Design a protein around this ligand. Structure first.
Ligand code: HEM
Length: 152
């Protein structure tokens, strides 16, 4: 649950992402894959990537980064009223991709890391607080659907 002022911070930060969605999406996935190499094994189309240089050179990884952040941005713009947008993603990630909630924690922290890396000194403590709360809400509502499905 976020206040109006917190949502305003989230959507202000998101403007930074929308200026370069592919570059942000690429770096988020690279941070996930290099920090948590077990996550790469869930992607049949990226498991061939052995080095970060190959990851950086992969145009399909940048494409998928655009898909991921476009979906997340659509959810964030609903300011919590995201049941219709979130349900299909919860279902596909639990039942088809088999993504444990832990990996959603990993990618949430990766987003925070990338924002500081690309905007050092321009991602203030209030903005980090609000973005963190928004990603916690996203993860918590996914977790509720995971529990319904019995997925661990
Ligand atoms: C912010 C969190 C995430 C968002 C918004 C997101 C979004 C998406 C979307 C929109 C798709 C394509 C449609 C679909 O299959 O539902 C997708 C596919 C997929 N996601 Fe995610 N995802 C997220 C996190 C993760 C994480 C953490 C993992 C694994 C560590 C993951 C694994 C996958 C896989 C394996 C696919 C299929 C890729 C393919 O072969 O095309 N997702 N995701």
């Amino acid at each position: 649950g976020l206040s109006d002022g917190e949502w305003q911070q989230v959507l202000n930060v998101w403007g930074k992402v929308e200026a370069d969605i592919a570059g942000h999406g690429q770096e988020v996935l690279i941070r996930l894959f290099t920090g948590h190499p077990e996550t790469l094994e869930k992607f049949d189309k990226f498991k061939h990537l052995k080095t970060e240089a190959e990851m950086k050179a992969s145009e399909d990884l940048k494409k998928h980064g655009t898909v991921v952040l476009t979906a997340l941005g659509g959810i964030l713009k609903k300011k919590g009223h995201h049941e219709a947008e979130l349900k299909p993603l919860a279902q596909s990630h639990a039942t088809k991709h088999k993504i444990p909630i832990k990996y959603l924690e990993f990618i949430s922290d990766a987003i925070i890391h990338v924002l500081h890396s690309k905007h050092p000194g321009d991602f203030g403590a209030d903005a980090q607080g609000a973005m963190t709360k928004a990603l916690e809400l996203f993860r918590n509502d996914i977790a509720a659907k995971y529990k319904e499905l019995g997925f661990q």
